[PDB]
Fold this sequence. Notes:
Blueprint: E1 3-10, H1 25-38, E2 41-44, E3 58-63, E4 72-80, E5 83-85, E6 91-97, E7 105-112
PDB class: viral protein
Keywords: SARS-CoV-2, Nsp1, viral protein
Assembly: monomeric
Amino acid sequence: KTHVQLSLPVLQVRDVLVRGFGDSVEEVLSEARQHLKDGTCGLVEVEKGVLPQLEQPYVFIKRSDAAPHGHVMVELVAELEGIQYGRSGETLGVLVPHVGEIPVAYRKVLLRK
Length: 113
């Protein structure tokens, strides 16, 4: 399927144990997609002070359309030193590995895979 329904655990930035997916734009997009498929991907909602607490390159989920079955349609955009790879809508948050942190909420998304 071109799209996959996911419920992403929303983590508080200070709980996050593994603060990024790797060391290149291509690696972080690769690892993010693998974690999304394996159900080991968390979401941190972006506010003032969040991103400097995480590791670049960043992987964002961005709204790709204006919401089947409650799931917002999203796609992946990476960022490294202020340059984004991909073009999409509003940021829903930054993806991180999930290694058992307790979430505060779930974000239902339809991910363009």
